Design a protein around this nucleic acid. Structure first.
Lengths: 149, 52, 386, 136, 61, 131
RNA sequence: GCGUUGGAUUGUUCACCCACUAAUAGGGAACGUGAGCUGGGUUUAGACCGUCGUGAGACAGGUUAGUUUUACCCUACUGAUGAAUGUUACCGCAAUAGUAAUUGAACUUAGUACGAGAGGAACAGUUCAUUCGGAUAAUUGGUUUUUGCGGCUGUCUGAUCAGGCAUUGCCGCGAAGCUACCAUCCGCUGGAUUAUGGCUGAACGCCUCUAAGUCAGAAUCCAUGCUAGAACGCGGUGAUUUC
RNA sequence: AAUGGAUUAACGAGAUUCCCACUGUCCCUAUCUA
RNA sequence: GUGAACAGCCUCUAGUUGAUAGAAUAAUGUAGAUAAGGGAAGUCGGCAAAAUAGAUCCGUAACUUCGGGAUAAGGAUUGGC
C-alpha cells in the first residue's frame, strides 16, 4: 500500500481513489481527485493556483525547509527486518509529527503577529473621523439606562 | 461444457460434501455455540449486580 | 415468418409479477433444514444496512493469477445491535402444510414492542399486554401448559426476536418483530433453550463469525412508475418516431388476438423483495471495541465510521458485519441475514480472509483524509484556531 | 485467451470497437492499423466486436509499406487510452491507442517496441515482453 | 356520476375511494339549509329535533 | 464535462507538454536536431519550420515571422523561465524527499539554468538571421 | 433445456462473399408484425427520352417529382386501491401460476497413455472468462437550477460596493441524487425416466436385454431453491369503549 | 442531325457517387430544464 | 450604448402588465441541451445534429467564352493597460 501524493494537490491518495495518467515517456501522474485531474488537462500552473500546496511552499507561507521534514524521504536499500527497528519507528513517527506541529504553529505566529497593531490603527481612523456618529451613540446609552429606570 | 444440473458434477460435488467442507462447517458450529453459552454467563452476572 | 435473427429474451420471467412488496421487512421463505444432533443454534438474524466502504486485501488464493497479491474491493456495513427474544412458536405438520398452534410471550416486553402493536401510540392507553401478565400469577400454569403442548406436539419451533431501534441513530422508535427457526436437535431441547432466553438479548457473534458465506434478503429501492426501456432493457426506436421512441414497437401479431403475458409493458420498478446468496463476511466488530477500523497493519486508532458519519445515516456505535459485494436494499433499511442453506463446496467458501486497510474517508464528497487529526495535521493551523 | 496467450485474461474496459484506427508500435513499417474483427469475441444482436488491452485482433494496414498493405494479419493491442482498472486501487489510462502485429502463434514480427507497453498485455503474452523496452 | 374522478384518502369515512370537494354546489345547498331553518322557526318548531328528511335535485332547462 | 474544454483537451488532441519542452532547450544537441529535422511527408511544414517552445509545425517560413511576433508565443517564452515543475515539486510540498528536491533546484540554479539561457539566446540569434 | 452473429453491392427479399465463432440449423403464427414505424419501392394529377400511331394518346419500356391525420370508449395486458365475512393490530402457513442460467478457454494428469515417427488426449483436484439475469453507488467516469462558488462580454442602477436582464446569457470546477459490462458484486441439488449398456430369465428340453421381476443411465421431466399469495383458501396471538 | 444533334466556362432550394474535417446516427444507453 | 447596420441584446419618452388559476414533479411526449472510448460499423440514403463563421496580414489549383473560378483550398493573429 502506498499513500502517494497528488501530482497537483499534494494531498494523500489512499488506495482506491483518483486516476493515474501515464505519459508516453512513461512516468506516472497520480491524482488526488477529479478536480485536480480536470485542471491538469487544461494546462494550468500550480505555482499560480492559490489553493494547492506547491503555491504555499513557494509563496512564503507554511514552512518548507526543516530538519523534521527530512525523515521521510524514500529508501532504495532494504533494511532486512529487525523488529527493534520497527518498534522504534512506530515510536518515532508519533514523535516527529508532534515536533512538526509545534514548529508549524510557531511558524504561523511569525506570519500573523502584529495584526493587532494594524487592527487598532484601523480603529483610530473609524472612531476619530466620525464625530457625528459618536454623538448618536451617547444618547443611545442614556435612553438605555432610562428605560430600566 | 457440462451444465449446473448434470448427473456427473452433482456426484463429484457429493463426494466433497462428505469430506472436507462439512468438517469446516462442523468445526464452525461448535465454536459459535461456545460464545452463545458464554453470552448467558455475562447476562446472568449483570443480573447478580442488581441483586446486590 | 421466422424472426430472421434469433436473440435472447429481454428480461427474466422468473421474477414476475413485478409489483410492490407486502412490507418493508422482507419475509424469509425457507431456512436451513435441521441437523438433529447439533447444539442449539439460531438460523438467521436481522439488522440495518448503512453505507459502503472499500477494503484492500492480500488475496491468499491458490491457483489464481492474483495469488499472494493485493486486491481492492467494496463491502457493505450493516449496523447490528443485540437482538432480544420475546417468544416461542410451534408448528404441527398437517397434510396441508405447517400450522401454528401456540405462541408464548415473555412476562414483560420492551416499550419498542408495545409500540409495534399500535398505529396511534400517543393517544392510546398503552394496554398491549396488561391482561397477559396477570396470567403469570402464583405458578403461571397457563404458560407451562402451553410450553408442554409445544413439547409434546409441534415438530418445529420458531423463536420471536426483535431489534433494539433505540440504540440506532435511525429515528423510528418502533422495533420489528420476526420469527427465527432453530436447528438444535430434540425439540424439547429447542424449547427449553428459548424459555431460558426470555427478556434476554442475543449477540451477533453468537450467530456468525468471519469467513462465512451468508445471504441477505430485503426490499429493494423503489423508483415509481417506470417506462419499458429502463425497466426491461428494450432497444430505443431511432429518432423522432411517431408516438414516441422509448417503447416496444410491435406488441403482438394477428393471432392470438390478445397481448400475451411476456411482452414487457411499463409499470412499477423497484421496491420488490429479493434474495441474493453467497455473500462473504469479512469482519465482525464489537461496539465496546474502540479502534474497530484498525487492522493488524494500520495500528491507527479509528472506528469504521467515516468522517461526518455515513450519508443519510449516523454513527455505528454497536456491533456490525462487514460483508463484501452489495446487499440488495438501501441505507437505513432492514435486512435479514440467513445462513447459507446448504454446505457450500467451492474453495471461495473456505478462504481465511485478512483485512489490510479499511477506508474511512468521508462519503459526503471526494474525501481525502482518514481521521480528523490528519486534516489538522496536513492543513496546518487555521484562522479560527488562533 | 486462445492460442499463444498463456494464462487467463481478466475483464477490462473495451476501448476499441470495429473500425478503430490505432497506431503501430514496432519497427515493421506500418504506421496505423485498422481493425476488422476481434478474436475471442462474443455474439449478440447489434453489438460490435470490441477490443481491449492485451487482445488479438485481425487488423489491416492503411498507411505503410506497399508490401504490407491489402492483407489481413493478426495484431496485439498494447495501449488503450480508455481508463481501466488495475486490481490495486487505481484507474489508469494511456495517451493513445497502439498495437503491434504478429503471427497467430503470438510471435512478434518486428524487433523492437516504441513507447510504453501495458502491464496486463505483457503478462498475457511472453513474446511481446521480450521485445518491450519499457513496461508500464 | 363518478367516472375518471381522482381518488383521495378522505373518502374512507363513507367507504368510497372517489371523493371531491365541490365548492359552488355547497354554497347553494347551505344557502337553502339556512333558508329552511329560518322557515321552521317561523312556524314555531324545535331546533334540536329538526333533520333534513327529503332532498331532491333535477334538471333545469 | 463542458462543451469548449472537451473540444481542445481530449486525450486525442493533447499537445506535447511543458515538461519535455524544457528538456529540448536545455542542451545543444537536441536543439540542432529539431532545427534540422529530415523532411517528412506526414507533417504540415514538410518537416521544416518547427518552433521549439510551442510544439507546433508551421506551414511556411513566412508563418514563423508572424508567429514569433505575437502574444501567443510570448506566453511560452515567459512560461519556461524557471524550474519546470516535475513530480518532485509536489512530493516536497508534503514533507517527502526534500534532499531529492533541493538538489535538483540547486542544479537548475547553478548548471541547467545558464545552459538553457545560452541556448534561447542563440535561437533569437539564428531565427533573426534567417528570417 | 439452452444458443444460433458482425459487415460488404441493388427498394430489393432472389442470388453470392469477408471475418469471427462452440455453431453461423430449417420453418410457422393473414408468405407474423401500415389505426407501431418506414413510404425507400407499390398506384393519380407535372415533366422528359425510346418504340408504335396521321391524331388524341397507349406503352416493349427507362428516369425524376410527389397528403390519410383517431384512441378519451369495452376487452386484453403491465402496474394501483378497494366495500363486506364482530371491529382492530401483529406474526405466519402455501393451493395455484411463473421459473434460469449458459458456452469457451486455462493450470495440473502430462509431453503421460497411444505412436516407427510427426504428433498427442481423457475423468478427478483447481482458476478465470463469453452471452443472459438480478440488484448495488464505496471507488472511477457521465450528468448540474444546489443557479453552490468563482470568471467573462453587452447594457442598465452617478462611480466603488452589491445587483437586474440576455426564453437556464456564456465559461471553469461542482457535492447530493440518478446512473454505465463506461463501474463493482452474486447466480443451488434431490428424485424419476428416454436412447443405450446389463443381470436373473422363460416363451422354444438350447439361446436371449423382457414377457413377470430388476440394476444403472441424458443439458430431458417433476421437485429443493427463487418471485407473487387465492382481494369469496386457512391458522396463532394482542387489546376490546359504560354517558 | 433546328423531331435539332456533339462540345463546353459561369450559374442551380435539380439528380447520383466518393474523400478530409466533424459528430449520440450507432456500439448503449444515461441525465438536467420548461 | 455595443456594431459595418433600421441585425441581435439592453435602456429613456409613451404604453401595457391582458392570454383560467392553485398544488405536486411518475411514465410517454413537445421544445432545448451536455456526454467517457471509438468515429457512419447506423441507414434505402450522413436525414438530423455537430464542426466552420466577423475582421486584419500572408497565400490561392485544374479549367475558360479571358470577364471569371475565389471568401478557392491552406495558414499566423484578435483582451486590458
Amino acid at each position: 500500500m502506498r499513500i502517494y501524493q497528488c501530482h497537483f494537490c499534494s494531498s494523500p491518495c489512499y488506495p482506491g481513489h483518483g486516476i493515474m495518467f501515464v505519459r508516453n515517456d512513461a512516468k506516472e501522474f497520480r491524482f488526488c481527485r477529479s478536480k485536480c485531474h480536470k485542471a491538469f488537462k487544461q494546462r494550468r500552473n500550480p505555482r499560480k493556483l492559490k489553493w494547492t500546496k506547491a503555491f504555499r511552499k513557494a509563496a512564503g507561507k507554511e514552512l518548507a525547509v526543516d530538519s523534521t521534514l527530512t525523515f521521510a524521504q524514500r529508501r532504495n536499500v532494504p533494511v532486512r527486518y529487525n523488529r527493534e527497528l520497527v518498534a522504534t519507528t512506530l515510536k518515532a513517527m508519533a514523535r516527529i509529527e508532534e515536533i512538526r506541529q509545534k514548529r508549524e504553529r510557531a511558524f504561523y505566529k511569525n506570519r500573523m503577529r502584529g495584526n493587532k497593531e494594524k487592527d487598532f490603527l484601523r480603529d483610530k481612523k473609524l472612531v476619530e473621523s466620525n464625530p457625528e456618529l459618536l454623538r448618536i451613540r451617547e444618547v443611545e446609552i442614556a435612553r438605555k439606562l432610562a428605560k430600566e429606570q | 461444457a457440462k451444465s449446473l444440473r448434470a448427473s456427473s458434477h452433482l456426484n463429484a460435488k457429493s463426494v466433497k460434501r462428505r469430506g472436507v467442507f462439512q468438517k469446516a462447517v462442523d468445526a464452525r458450529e461448535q465454536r459459535i455455540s461456545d460464545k452463545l453459552k458464554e453470552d448467558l454467563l455475562k447476562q446472568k452476572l449483570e443480573d447478580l449486580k442488581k441483586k446486590e | 415468418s421466422h424472426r430472421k435473427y434469433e436473440a435472447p429474451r429481454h428480461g427474466h420471467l422468473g421474477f414476475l409479477p413485478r409489483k410492490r412488496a407486502a412490507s418493508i421487512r422482507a419475509r424469509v421463505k425457507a431456512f436451513p433444514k435441521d441437523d438433529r444432533s447439533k447444539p442449539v443454534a439460531l438460523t438467521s438474524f436481522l439488522g440495518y444496512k448503512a453505507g459502503m466502504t472499500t477494503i484492500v486485501r492480500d488475496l491468499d488464493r491458490p491457483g489464481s493469477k492474483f495469488h499472494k497479491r493485493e486486491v481492492v474491493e467494496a463491502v457493505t456495513v450493516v449496523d447490528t445491535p443485540p437482538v432480544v427474544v420475546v417468544g416461542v412458536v410451534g408448528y404441527v405438520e398437517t397434510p396441508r402444510g405447517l400450522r401454528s398452534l401456540t405462541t408464548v410471550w415473555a412476562e414483560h416486553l420492551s416499550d419498542e414492542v408495545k409500540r409495534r402493536f399500535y398505529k396511534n401510540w400517543y393517544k392510546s392507553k398503552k394496554k398491549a399486554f396488561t391482561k397477559y401478565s396477570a396470567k403469570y400469577a402464583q405458578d403461571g400454569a397457563g404458560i407451562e401448559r402451553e410450553l408442554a403442548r409445544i413439547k409434546k406436539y409441534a415438530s418445529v419451533v420458531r423463536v420471536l426476536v426483535h431489534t433494539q431501534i433505540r440504540k440506532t441513530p435511525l429515528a423510528q422508535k418502533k422495533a420489528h418483530l420476526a420469527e427465527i427457526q432453530l436447528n438444535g436437535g430434540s425439540i424439547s431441547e429447542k424449547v427449553d433453550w428459548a424459555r431460558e432466553h426470555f427478556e434476554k438479548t442475543v449477540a451477533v457473534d453468537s450467530v456468525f463469525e468471519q469467513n462465512e458465506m451468508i445471504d441477505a434478503i430485503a426490499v429493494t429501492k423503489g423508483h415509481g412508475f417506470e417506462g419499458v426501456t429502463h425497466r426491461w432493457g428494450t432497444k430505443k426506436l431511432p429518432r423522432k418516431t411517431h408516438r414516441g421512441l422509448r417503447k416496444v414497437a410491435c406488441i403482438g401479431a394477428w393471432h392470438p388476438a390478445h397481448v400475451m403475458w411476456s411482452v414487457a409493458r411499463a409499470g412499477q420498478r423497484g421496491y420488490h423483495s429479493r434474495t441474493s446468496i453467497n455473500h462473504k463476511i469479512y469482519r465482525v466488530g464489537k461496539g465496546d471495541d474502540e479502534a474497530n477500523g484498525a487492522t493488524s497493519f494500520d495500528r491507527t486508532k479509528k472506528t469504521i465510521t467515516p468522517m461526518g458519519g455515513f450519508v443519510h445515516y449516523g454513527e455505528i456505535k454497536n456491533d456490525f458485519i462487514m460483508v463484501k459485494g452489495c446487499i440488495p436494499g438501501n441505507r437505513k433499511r432492514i435486512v435479514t441475514l440467513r445462513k447459507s442453506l446448504y454446505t457450500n463446496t467451492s474453495r471461495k467458501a473456505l478462504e481465511e480472509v485478512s483485512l489490510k486497510w479499511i477506508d474511512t474517508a468521508s462519503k459526503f464528497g471526494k474525501g481525502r483524509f482518514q481521521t480528523p487529526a490528519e486534516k489538522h495535521a496536513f492543513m496546518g493551523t487555521l484562522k479560527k484556531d488562533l | 485467451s486462445g492460442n499463444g496467450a498463456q494464462g487467463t485474461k481478466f475483464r477490462i474496459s473495451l476501448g476499441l470497437p470495429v473500425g478503430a484506427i490505432m497506431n503501430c508500435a514496432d519497427n515493421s513499417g506500418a504506421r496505423n492499423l485498422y481493425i476488422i474483427a476481434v478474436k475471442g469475441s462474443g455474439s449478440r444482436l447489434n453489438r460490435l466486436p470490441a477490443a481491449s488491452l492485451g487482445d488479438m485482433v485481425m487488423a489491416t494496414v492503411k498507411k505503410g509499406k506497399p508490401e504490407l498493405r491489402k492483407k489481413v494479419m493478426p495484431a496485439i493491442v498494447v495501449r488503450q487510452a480508455k481508463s481501466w482498472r488495475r486490481r490495486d486501487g487505481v484507474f489508469l489510462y494511456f495517451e493513445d491507442n497502439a498495437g503491434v502485429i504478429a503471427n497467430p502463434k503470438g510471435e512478434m514480427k518486428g524487433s523492437a517496441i516504441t513507447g510504453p507497453v501495458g502491464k496486463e498485455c505483457a503478462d498475457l503474452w511472453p513474446r511481446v515482453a521480450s521485445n518491450s523496452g519499457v513496461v508500464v | 356520476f363518478n367516472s375518471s374522478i381522482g381518488r383521495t384518502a378522505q373518502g374512507k369515512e363513507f367507504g368510497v375511494t372517489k371523493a371531491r370537494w365541490p365548492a359552488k354546489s355547497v354554497k347553494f345547498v347551505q344557502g337553502l339549509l339556512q333558508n329552511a331553518a329560518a322557515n321552521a322557526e317561523a312556524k314555531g318548531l324545535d331546533a334540536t329535533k329538526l333533520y333534513v328528511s327529503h332532498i331532491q335535485v333535477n334538471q333545469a332547462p | 464535462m463542458g462543451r469548449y474544454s472537451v473540444k481542445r483537451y481530449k486525450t486525442k488532441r493533447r499537445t506535447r507538454d511543458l515538461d519535455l519542452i524544457y528538456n529540448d532547450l536545455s542542451t545543444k544537441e537536441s536543439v540542432q536536431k529539431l532545427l534540422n529535422q529530415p523532411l517528412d511527408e506526414t507533417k504540415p511544414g514538410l518537416g521544416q519550420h518547427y518552433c521549439i517552445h510551442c510544439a507546433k509545425y508551421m506551414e511556411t517560413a513566412i508563418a514563423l515571422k508572424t508567429h514569433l511576433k505575437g502574444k501567443v508565443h510570448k506566453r511560452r517564452v515567459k512560461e519556461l523561465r524557471g524550474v519546470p515543475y516535475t513530480q518532485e515539486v509536489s512530493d516536497a510540498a508534503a514533507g517527502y524527499n526534500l534532499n531529492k528536491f533541493l538538489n535538483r533546484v540547486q542544479e537548475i540554479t547553478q548548471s541547467v539554468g545558464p545552459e538553457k539561457e545560452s541556448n534561447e539566446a542563440l535561437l533569437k540569434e539564428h531565427l533573426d538571421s534567417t528570417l
